[PDB]
């Protein structure tokens, strides 16, 4: 049985319904009118938690703003209004035969209103200089687009390389994400540079942020 | 509340034996299954032990077929995914699900032995927030990427722990991350220190000072 969801990502504004389509190769439908197919939502990190048994049965302390309806292959599952908590990964799911299959997954994200993100520099601390490297650190706070763009610089040099970041799950109550970008260089090389800076873009800055500071002032 | 353990680095071709233990609901009238998601990806399931009076029956995935063992001990209120002749494929999120899914438990294949934390104390260069200050520490260089838990010695209203997902360093098997304390100014005076408490892996944990600006 493959199971194919459908949109695969969607964005809904606070309070507005939103919908999602499941559809089986096969008749999930049994001889007690009901189907053998469940509805789950993920968050990140998180395990997967129910919202729909028997195909359209509400599971344990889930709000009567999740409606699950449809019959043998076209199933759909019913969001009232989407509240800040609802956002994650929504899996179908079909326990009519082995192997127990699971839709793609559809990520539904809160759409709040643009807000742009505070940002921190945070300049190598003496205890990891001692180790011979150097890391500096951007953090942003709760920014909404996700997308935000942080370009590192050292001496006016905008780097290309020894940066990684991660970007936390959409808030479960404002909706917002946070961001870390670490710059990572030896500490040869920091020692050699004067000015660090991370630039960040997004949607909510009208102008690029820059946080910056000269090694050995701060 | 379904507990889970057995997970973490296991060597490829080595084993592990991951334990899903039931609390306040007994594991013998109930279907097991076992279902995997590897890094950002979905759910694949993996296999069954049916209820006890279906004589322990145990229907599997072709994926992984052989190497796969799902036992019962209703003795222990527990039950179990055996998995053998691991491959680097097999490293993802393991969960077992019976009404309820257990919190899950990270498979590492890797020849590569554990790398603890490099904690790290930051101290904002850049602007303090208006009534809060903000301290951070930097989790540098660890493997396996999960579990990691950070917390800090100070919490309460107007207190905001932020913890970033690991993320993959430029070369070798390492992550980094760090995590946040934002809090009022009040809450970390001058002359005052602050603890981020980092728990990874099977290794001791770290209590790593962070003084207030």
């Known amino acids: 049985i493959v199971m194919t969801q459908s949109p695969l990502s969607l964005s809904v504004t606070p309070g507005e319904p939103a919908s999602i389509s499941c559809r089986s190769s096969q008749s999930l439908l049994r001889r007690d009118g009901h189907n053998d197919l469940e509805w789950y939502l993920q968050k990140p990190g998180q395990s997967p938690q129910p919202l729909i048994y028997?195909?359209?049965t509400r599971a344990s302390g889930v709000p009567d703003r999740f409606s699950g309806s449809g019959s043998g292959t076209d199933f759909t599952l019913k969001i009232i209004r989407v509240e800040a908590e609802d956002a994650g990964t929504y899996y179908c799911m079909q326990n009519k035969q082995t192997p127990l299959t699971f839709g793609q997954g559809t990520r539904l994200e809160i759409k709040r209103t643009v807000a742009a993100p505070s940002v921190f520099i945070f300049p190598p601390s003496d205890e990891q200089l001692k180790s011979g490297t150097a890391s500096v650190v951007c953090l942003l706070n709760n920014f909404y687009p996700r997308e935000a763009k942080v370009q590192w610089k050292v001496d006016n040099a905008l780097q290309s390389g020894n940066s990684q970041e991660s970007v936390t799950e959409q808030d479960s109550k404002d909706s917002t994400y946070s961001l870390s970008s670490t710059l990572t260089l030896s500490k040869a090389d920091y020692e050699k540079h004067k000015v660090y800076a991370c630039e960040v873009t997004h949607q909510g800055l009208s102008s690029p942020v820059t946080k910056s500071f000269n090694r050995g002032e701060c | 509340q379904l507990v889970e353990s057995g997970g973490g680095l296991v060597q490829p071709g080595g084993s592990l034996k991951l334990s899903c233990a039931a609390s306040?609901?007994?594991?013998?009238?109930?279907?097991v299954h076992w279902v995997r998601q590897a890094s950002g990806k979905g759910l694949e399931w993996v296999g069954r032990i049916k209820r006890n009076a279906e004589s322990d029956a145990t229907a599997y995935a072709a994926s992984m077929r052989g190497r796969l063992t799902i036992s019962r001990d209703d003795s222990k209120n527990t039950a179990f995914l055996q998995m053998n002749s691991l491959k680097s494929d097999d490293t993802a999120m393991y969960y077992c699900?019976?009404?309820?899914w257990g919190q899950g438990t990270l498979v590492t294949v890797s020849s590569a032995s554990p790398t603890s934390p490099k904690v790290f104390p930051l101290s904002l260069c850049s602007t303090q927030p208006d009534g809060n200050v903000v301290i951070a520490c930097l989790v540098q260089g660890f493997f396996p990427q999960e579990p990691l838990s950070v917390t800090w010695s100070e919490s309460g209203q107007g207190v905001t722990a932020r913890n970033f997902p690991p993320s993959q360093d430029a070369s070798g098997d390492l992550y980094t991350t760090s995590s946040q304390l934002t809090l009022p100014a009040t809450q970390c005076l001058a002359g005052k220190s602050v603890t981020c408490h980092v728990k990874h892996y099977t290794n001791p944990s770290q209590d790593v000072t962070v003084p207030c600006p």
């Open positions: 306040g609901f007994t594991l013998s009238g109930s279907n």
């Open positions: 699900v019976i009404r309820q």
């Open positions: 028997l195909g359209s």
